[PDB]
PDB file of N, CA and C and ligand atoms in Angstrom:
ATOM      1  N   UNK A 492      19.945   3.905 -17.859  1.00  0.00           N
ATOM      2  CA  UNK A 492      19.242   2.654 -18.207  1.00  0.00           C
ATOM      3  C   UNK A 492      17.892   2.587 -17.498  1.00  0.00           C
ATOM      4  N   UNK A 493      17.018   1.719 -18.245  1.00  0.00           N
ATOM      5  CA  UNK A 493      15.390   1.881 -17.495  1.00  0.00           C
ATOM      6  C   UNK A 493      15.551   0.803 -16.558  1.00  0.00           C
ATOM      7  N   UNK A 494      15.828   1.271 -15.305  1.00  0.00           N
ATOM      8  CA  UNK A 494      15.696   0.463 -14.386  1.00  0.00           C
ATOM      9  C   UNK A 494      14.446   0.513 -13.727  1.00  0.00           C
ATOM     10  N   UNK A 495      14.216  -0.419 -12.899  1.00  0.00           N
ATOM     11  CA  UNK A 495      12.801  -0.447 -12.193  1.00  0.00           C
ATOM     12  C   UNK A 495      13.188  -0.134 -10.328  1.00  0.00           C
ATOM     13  N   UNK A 496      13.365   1.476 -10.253  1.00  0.00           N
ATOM     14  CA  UNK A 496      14.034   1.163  -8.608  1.00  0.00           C
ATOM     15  C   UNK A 496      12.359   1.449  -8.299  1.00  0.00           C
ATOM     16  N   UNK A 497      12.472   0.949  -6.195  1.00  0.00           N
ATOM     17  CA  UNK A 497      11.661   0.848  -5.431  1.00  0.00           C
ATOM     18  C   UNK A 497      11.430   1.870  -4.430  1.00  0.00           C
ATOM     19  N   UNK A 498      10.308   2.426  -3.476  1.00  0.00           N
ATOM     20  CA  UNK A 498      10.531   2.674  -2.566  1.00  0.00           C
ATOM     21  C   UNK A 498       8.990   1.820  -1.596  1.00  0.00           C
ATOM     22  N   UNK A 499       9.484   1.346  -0.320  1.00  0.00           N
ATOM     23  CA  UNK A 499       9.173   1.261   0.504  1.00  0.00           C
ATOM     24  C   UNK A 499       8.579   1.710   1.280  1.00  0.00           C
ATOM     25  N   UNK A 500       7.116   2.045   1.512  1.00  0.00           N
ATOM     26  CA  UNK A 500       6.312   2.522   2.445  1.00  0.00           C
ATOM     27  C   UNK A 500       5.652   1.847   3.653  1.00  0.00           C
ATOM     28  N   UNK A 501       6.084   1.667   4.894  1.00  0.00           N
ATOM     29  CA  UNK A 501       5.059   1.388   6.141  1.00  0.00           C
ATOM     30  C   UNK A 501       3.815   1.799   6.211  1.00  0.00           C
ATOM     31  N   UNK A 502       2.540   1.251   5.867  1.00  0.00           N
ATOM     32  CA  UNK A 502       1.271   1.396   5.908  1.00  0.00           C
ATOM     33  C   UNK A 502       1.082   1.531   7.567  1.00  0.00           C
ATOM     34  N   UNK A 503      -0.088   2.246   7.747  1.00  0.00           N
ATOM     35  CA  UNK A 503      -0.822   2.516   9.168  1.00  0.00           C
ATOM     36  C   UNK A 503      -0.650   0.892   9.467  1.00  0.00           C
ATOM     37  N   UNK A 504      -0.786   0.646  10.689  1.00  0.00           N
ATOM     38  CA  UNK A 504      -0.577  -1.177  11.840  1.00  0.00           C
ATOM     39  C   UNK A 504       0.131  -1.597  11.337  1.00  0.00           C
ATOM     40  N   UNK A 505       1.426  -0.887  10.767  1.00  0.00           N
ATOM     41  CA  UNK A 505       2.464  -1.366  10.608  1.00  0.00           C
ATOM     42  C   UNK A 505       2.943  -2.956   9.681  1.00  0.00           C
ATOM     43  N   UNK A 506       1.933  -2.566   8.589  1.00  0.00           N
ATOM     44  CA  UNK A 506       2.377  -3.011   7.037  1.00  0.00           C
ATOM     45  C   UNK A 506       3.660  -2.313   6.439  1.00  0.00           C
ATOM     46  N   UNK A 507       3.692  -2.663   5.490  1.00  0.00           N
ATOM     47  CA  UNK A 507       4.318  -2.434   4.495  1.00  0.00           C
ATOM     48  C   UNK A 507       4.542  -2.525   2.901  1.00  0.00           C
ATOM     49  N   UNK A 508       4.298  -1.494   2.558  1.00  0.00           N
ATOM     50  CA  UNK A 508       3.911  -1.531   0.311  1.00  0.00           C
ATOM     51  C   UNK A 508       5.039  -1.365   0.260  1.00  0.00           C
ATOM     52  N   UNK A 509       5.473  -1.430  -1.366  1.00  0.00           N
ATOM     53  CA  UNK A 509       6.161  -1.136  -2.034  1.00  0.00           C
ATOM     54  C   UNK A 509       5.751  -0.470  -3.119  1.00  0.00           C
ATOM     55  N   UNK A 510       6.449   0.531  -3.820  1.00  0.00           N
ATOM     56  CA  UNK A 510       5.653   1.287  -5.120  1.00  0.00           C
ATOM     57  C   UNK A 510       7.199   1.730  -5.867  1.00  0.00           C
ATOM     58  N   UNK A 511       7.321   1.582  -7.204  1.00  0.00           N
ATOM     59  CA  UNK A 511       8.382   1.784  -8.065  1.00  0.00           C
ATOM     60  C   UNK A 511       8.464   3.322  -7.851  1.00  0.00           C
ATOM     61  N   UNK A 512       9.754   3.704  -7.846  1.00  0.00           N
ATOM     62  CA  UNK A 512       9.943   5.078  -7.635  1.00  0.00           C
ATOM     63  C   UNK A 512       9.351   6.386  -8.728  1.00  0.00           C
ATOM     64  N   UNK A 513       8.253   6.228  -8.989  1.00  0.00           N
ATOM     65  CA  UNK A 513       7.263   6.723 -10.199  1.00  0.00           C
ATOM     66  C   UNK A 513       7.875   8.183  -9.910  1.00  0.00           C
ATOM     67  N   UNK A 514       8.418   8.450 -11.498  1.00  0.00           N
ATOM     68  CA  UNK A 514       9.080   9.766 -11.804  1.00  0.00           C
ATOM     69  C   UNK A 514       8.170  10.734 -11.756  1.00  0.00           C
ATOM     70  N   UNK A 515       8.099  12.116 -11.902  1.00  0.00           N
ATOM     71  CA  UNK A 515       6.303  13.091 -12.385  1.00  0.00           C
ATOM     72  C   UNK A 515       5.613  12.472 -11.225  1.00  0.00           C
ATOM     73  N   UNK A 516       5.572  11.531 -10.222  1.00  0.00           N
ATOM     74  CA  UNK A 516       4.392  11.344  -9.147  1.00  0.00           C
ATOM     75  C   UNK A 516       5.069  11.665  -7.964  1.00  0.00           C
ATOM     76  N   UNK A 517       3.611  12.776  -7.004  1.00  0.00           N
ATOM     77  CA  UNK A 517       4.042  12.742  -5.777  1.00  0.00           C
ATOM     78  C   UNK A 517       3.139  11.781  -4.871  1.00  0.00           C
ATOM     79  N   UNK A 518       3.856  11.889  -3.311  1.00  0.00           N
ATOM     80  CA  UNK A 518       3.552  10.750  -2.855  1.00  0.00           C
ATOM     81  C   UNK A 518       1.915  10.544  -3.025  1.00  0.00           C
ATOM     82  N   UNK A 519       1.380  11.285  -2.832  1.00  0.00           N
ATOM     83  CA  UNK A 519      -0.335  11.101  -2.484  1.00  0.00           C
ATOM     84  C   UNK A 519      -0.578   9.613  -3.975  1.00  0.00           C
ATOM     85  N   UNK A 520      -0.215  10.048  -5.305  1.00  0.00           N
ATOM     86  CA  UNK A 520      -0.546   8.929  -6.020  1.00  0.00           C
ATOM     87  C   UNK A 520      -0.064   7.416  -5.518  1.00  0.00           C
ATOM     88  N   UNK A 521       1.401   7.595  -5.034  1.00  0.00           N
ATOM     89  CA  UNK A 521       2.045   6.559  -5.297  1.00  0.00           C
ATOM     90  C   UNK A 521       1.130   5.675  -4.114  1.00  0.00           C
ATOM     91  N   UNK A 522       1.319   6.329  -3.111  1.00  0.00           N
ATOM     92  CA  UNK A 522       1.125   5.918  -1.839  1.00  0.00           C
ATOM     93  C   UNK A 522      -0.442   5.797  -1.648  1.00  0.00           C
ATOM     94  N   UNK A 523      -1.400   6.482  -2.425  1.00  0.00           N
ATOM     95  CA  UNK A 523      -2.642   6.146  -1.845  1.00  0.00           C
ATOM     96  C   UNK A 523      -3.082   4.914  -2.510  1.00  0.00           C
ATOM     97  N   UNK A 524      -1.991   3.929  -3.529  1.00  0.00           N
ATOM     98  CA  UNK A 524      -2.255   2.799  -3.950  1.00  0.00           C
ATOM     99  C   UNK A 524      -1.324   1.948  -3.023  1.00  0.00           C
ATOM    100  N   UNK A 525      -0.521   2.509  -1.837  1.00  0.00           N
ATOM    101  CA  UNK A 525      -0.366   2.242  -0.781  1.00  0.00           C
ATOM    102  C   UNK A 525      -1.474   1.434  -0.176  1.00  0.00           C
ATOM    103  N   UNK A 526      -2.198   2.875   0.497  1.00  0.00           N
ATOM    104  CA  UNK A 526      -3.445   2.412   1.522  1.00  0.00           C
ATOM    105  C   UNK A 526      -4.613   1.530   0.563  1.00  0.00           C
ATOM    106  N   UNK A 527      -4.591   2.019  -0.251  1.00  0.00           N
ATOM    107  CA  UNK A 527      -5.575   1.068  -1.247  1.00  0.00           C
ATOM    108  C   UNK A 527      -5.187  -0.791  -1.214  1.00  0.00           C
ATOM    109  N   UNK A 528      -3.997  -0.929  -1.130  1.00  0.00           N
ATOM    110  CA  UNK A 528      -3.414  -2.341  -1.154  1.00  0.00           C
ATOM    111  C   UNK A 528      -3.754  -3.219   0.264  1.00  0.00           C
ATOM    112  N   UNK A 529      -3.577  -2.466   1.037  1.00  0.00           N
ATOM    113  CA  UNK A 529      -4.464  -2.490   2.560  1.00  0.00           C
ATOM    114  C   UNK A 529      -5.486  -2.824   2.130  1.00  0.00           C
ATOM    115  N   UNK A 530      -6.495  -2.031   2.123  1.00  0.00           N
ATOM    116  CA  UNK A 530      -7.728  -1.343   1.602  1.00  0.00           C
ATOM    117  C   UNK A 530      -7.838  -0.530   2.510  1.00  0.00           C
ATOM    118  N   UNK A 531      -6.945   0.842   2.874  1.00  0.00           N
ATOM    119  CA  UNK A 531      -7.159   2.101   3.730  1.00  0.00           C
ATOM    120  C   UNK A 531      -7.587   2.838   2.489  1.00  0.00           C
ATOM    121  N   UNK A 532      -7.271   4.094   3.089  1.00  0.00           N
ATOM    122  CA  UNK A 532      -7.442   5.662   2.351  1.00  0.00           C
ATOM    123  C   UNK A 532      -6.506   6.383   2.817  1.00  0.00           C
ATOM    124  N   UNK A 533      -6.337   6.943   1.899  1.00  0.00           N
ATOM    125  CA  UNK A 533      -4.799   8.144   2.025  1.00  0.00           C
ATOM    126  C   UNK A 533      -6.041   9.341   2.818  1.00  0.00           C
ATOM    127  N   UNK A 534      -6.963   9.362   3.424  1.00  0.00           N
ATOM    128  CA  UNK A 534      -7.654  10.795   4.446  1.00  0.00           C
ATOM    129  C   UNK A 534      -7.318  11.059   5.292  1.00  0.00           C
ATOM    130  N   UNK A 535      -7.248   9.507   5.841  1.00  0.00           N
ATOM    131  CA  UNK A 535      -6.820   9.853   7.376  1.00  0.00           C
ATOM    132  C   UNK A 535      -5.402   9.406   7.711  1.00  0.00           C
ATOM    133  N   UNK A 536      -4.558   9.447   6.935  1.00  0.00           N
ATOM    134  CA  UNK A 536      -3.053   9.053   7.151  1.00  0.00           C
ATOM    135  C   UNK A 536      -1.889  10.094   7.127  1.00  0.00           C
ATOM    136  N   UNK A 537      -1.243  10.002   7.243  1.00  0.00           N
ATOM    137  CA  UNK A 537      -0.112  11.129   7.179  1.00  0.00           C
ATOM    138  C   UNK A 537       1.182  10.463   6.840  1.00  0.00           C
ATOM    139  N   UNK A 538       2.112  11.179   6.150  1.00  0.00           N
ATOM    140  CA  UNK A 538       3.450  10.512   5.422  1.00  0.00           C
ATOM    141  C   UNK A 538       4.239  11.066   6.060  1.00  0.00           C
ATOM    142  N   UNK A 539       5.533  10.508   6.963  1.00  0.00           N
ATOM    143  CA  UNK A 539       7.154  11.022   7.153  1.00  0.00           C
ATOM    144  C   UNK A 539       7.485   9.425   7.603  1.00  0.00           C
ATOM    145  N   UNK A 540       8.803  10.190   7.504  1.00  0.00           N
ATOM    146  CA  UNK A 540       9.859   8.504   7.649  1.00  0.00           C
ATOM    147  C   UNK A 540      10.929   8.575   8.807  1.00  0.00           C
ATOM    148  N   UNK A 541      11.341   7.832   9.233  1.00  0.00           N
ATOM    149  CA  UNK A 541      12.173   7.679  10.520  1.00  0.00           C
ATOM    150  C   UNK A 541      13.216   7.995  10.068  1.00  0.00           C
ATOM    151  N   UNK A 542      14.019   8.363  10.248  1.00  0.00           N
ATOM    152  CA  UNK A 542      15.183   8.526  10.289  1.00  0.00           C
ATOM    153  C   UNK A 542      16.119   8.516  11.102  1.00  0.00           C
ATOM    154  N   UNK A 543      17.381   8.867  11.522  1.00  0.00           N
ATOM    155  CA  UNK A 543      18.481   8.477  12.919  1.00  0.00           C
ATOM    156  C   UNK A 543      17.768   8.808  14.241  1.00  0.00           C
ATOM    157  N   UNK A 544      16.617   7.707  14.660  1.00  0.00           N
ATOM    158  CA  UNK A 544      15.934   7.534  15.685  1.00  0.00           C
ATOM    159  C   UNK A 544      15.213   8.636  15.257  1.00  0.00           C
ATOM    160  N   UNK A 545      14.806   9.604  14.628  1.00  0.00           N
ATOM    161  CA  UNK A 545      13.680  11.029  14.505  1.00  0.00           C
ATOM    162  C   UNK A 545      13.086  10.589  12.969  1.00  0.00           C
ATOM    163  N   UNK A 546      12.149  11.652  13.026  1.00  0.00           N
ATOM    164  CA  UNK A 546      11.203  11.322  12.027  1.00  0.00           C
ATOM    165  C   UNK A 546      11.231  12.699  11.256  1.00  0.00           C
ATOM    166  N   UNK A 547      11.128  12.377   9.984  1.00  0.00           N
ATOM    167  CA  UNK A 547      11.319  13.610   9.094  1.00  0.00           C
ATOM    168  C   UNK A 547       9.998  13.269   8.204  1.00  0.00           C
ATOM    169  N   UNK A 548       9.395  14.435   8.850  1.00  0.00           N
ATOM    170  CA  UNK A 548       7.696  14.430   7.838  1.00  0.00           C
ATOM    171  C   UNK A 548       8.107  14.838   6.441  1.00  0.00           C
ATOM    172  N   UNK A 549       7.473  13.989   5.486  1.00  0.00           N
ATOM    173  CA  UNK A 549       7.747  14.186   4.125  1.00  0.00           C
ATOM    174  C   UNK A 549       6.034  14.788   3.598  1.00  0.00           C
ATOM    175  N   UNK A 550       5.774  15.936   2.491  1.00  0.00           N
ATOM    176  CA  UNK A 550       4.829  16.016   2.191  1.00  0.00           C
ATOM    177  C   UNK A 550       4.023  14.960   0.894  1.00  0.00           C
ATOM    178  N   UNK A 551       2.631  15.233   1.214  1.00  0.00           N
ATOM    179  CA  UNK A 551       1.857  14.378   0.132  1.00  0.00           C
ATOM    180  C   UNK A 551       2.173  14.536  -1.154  1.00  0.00           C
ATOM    181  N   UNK A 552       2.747  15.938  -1.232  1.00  0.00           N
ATOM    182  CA  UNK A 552       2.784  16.294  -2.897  1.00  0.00           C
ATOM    183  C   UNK A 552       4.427  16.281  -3.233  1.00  0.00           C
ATOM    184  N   UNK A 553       5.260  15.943  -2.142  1.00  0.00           N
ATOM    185  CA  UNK A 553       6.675  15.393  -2.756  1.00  0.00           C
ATOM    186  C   UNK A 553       6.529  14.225  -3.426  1.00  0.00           C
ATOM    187  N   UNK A 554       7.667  14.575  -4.016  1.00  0.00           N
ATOM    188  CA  UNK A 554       7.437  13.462  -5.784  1.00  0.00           C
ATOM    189  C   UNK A 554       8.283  12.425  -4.994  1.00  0.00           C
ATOM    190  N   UNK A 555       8.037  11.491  -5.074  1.00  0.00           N
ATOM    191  CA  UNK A 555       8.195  10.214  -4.570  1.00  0.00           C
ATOM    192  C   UNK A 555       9.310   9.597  -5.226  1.00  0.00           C
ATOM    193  N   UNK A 556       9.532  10.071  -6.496  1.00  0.00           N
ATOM    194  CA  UNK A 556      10.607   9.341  -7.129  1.00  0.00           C
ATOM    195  C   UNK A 556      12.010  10.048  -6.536  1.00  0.00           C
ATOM    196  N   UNK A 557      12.505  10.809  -5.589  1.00  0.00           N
ATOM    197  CA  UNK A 557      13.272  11.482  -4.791  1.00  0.00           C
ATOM    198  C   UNK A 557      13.983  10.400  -3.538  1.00  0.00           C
ATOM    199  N   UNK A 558      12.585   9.555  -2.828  1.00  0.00           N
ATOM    200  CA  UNK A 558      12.585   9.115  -1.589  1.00  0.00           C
ATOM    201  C   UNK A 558      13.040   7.637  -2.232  1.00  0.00           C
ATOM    202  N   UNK A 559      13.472   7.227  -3.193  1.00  0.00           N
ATOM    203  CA  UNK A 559      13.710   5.773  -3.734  1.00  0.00           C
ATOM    204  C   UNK A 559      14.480   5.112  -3.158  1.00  0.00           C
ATOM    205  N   UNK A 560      14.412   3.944  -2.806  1.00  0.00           N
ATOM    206  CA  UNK A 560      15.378   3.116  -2.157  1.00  0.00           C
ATOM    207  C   UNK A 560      15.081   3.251  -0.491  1.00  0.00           C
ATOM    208  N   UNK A 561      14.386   4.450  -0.012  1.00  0.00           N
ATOM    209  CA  UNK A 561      14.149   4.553   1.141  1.00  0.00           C
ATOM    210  C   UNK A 561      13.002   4.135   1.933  1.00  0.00           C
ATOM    211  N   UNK A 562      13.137   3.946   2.637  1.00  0.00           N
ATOM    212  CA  UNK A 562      11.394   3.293   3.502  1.00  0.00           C
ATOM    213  C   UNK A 562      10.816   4.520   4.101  1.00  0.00           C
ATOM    214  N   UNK A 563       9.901   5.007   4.092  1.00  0.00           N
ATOM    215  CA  UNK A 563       8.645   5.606   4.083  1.00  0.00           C
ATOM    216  C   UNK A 563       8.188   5.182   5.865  1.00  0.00           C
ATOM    217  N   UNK A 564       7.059   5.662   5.835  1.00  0.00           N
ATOM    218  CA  UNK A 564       6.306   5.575   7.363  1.00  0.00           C
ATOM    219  C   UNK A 564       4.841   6.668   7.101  1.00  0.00           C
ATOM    220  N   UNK A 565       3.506   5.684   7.294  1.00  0.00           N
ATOM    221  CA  UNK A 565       2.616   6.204   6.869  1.00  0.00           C
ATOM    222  C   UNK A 565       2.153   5.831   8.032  1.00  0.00           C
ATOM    223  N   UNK A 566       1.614   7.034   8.912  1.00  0.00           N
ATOM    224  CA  UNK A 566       0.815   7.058  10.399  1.00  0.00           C
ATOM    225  C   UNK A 566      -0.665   7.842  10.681  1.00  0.00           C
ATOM    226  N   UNK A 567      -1.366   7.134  11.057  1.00  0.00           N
ATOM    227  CA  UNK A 567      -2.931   7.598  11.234  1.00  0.00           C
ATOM    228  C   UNK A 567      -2.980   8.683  11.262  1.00  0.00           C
ATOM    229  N   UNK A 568      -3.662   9.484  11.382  1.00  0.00           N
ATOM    230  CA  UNK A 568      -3.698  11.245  11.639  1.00  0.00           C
ATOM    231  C   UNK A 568      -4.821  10.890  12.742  1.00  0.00           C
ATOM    232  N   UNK A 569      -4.646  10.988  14.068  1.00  0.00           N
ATOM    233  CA  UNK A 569      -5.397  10.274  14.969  1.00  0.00           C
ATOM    234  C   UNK A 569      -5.358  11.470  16.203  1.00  0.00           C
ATOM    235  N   UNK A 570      -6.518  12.854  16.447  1.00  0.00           N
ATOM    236  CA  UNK A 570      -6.401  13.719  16.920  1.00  0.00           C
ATOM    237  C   UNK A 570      -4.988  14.587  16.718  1.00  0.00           C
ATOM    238  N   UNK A 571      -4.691  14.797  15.778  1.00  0.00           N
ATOM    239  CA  UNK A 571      -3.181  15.697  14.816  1.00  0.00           C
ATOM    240  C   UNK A 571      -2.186  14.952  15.649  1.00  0.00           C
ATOM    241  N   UNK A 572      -1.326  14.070  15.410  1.00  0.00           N
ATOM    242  CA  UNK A 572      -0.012  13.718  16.330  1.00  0.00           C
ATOM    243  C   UNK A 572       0.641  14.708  15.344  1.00  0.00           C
ATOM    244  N   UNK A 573       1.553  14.600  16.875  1.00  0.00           N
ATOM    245  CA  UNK A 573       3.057  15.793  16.543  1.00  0.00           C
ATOM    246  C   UNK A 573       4.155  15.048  16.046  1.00  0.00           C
TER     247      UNK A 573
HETATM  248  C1  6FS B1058       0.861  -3.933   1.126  1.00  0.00           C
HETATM  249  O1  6FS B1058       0.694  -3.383  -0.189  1.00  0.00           O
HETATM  250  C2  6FS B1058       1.696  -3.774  -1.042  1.00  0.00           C
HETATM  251  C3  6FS B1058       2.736  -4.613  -0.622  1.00  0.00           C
HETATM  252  C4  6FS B1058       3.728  -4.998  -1.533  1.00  0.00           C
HETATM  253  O2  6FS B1058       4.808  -5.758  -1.171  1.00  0.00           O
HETATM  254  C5  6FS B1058       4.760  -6.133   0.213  1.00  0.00           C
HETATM  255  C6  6FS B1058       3.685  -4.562  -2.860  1.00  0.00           C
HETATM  256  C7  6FS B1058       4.668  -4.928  -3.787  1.00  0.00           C
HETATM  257  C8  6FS B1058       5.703  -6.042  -3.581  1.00  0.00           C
HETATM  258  S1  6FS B1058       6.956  -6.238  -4.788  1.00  0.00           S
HETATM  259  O3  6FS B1058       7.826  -7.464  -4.460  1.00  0.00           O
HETATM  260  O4  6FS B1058       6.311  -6.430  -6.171  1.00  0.00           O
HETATM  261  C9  6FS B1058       7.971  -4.719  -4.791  1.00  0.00           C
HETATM  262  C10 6FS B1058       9.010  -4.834  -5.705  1.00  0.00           C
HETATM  263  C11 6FS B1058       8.936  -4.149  -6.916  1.00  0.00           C
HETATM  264  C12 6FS B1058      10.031  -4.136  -7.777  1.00  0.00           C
HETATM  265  C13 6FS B1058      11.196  -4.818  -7.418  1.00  0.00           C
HETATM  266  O5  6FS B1058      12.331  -4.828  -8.184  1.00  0.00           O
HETATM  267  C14 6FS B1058      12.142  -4.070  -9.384  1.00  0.00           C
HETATM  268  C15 6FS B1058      11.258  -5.510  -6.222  1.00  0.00           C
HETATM  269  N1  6FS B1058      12.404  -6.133  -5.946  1.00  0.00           N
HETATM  270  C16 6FS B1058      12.608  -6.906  -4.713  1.00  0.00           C
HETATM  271  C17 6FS B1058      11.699  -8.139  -4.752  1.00  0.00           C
HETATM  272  O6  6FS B1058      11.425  -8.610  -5.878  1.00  0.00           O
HETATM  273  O7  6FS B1058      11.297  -8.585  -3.657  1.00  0.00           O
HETATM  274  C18 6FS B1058      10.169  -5.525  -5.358  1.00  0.00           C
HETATM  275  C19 6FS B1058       2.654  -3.716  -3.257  1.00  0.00           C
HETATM  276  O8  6FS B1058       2.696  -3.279  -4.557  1.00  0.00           O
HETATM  277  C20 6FS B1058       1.589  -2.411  -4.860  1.00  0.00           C
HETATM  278  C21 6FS B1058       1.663  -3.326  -2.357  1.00  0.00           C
END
């Protein structure tokens, strides 16, 4: 059935978007209407998500419709953090 699921992204200072789990899109589309909703830019940001207290870096070009239902974590790229 055409459902409309979600996923959840934490914007950089600790916002938060939402973007429908867009099938065929990886994150860089979904999410740079992310930082756009802010009014950031997907340049200087970087995508992974927390997970059981650790963080599992997700790439720009994973398709986003995978990560649905899950919350996201989008962090500055601020001298390369590890
Ligand atoms: C900060 O930048 C953004 C922040 C947003 O939010 C904080 C939204 C979007 C909010 S939203 O409410 O439209 C998400 C959304 C979509 C579909 C849903 O069901 C199908 C539901 N269901 C739960 C509910 O209705 O609350 C929620 C954003 O969108 C581009 C950008």
């Amino acid at each position: 059935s055409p459902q409309k699921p979600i996923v959840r992204v934490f914007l950089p200072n600790k916002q938060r978007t939402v973007v429908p789990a867009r099938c065929g899109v990886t994150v860089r589309d979904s999410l740079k209407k992310a930082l756009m909703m802010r009014g950031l830019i997907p340049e200087c940001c970087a995508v992974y998500r927390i997970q059981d207290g650790e963080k599992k870096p997700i790439g720009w070009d994973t398709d986003i419709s995978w990560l649905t239902g899950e919350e996201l974590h989008v962090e500055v790229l601020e001298n390369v953090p590890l």
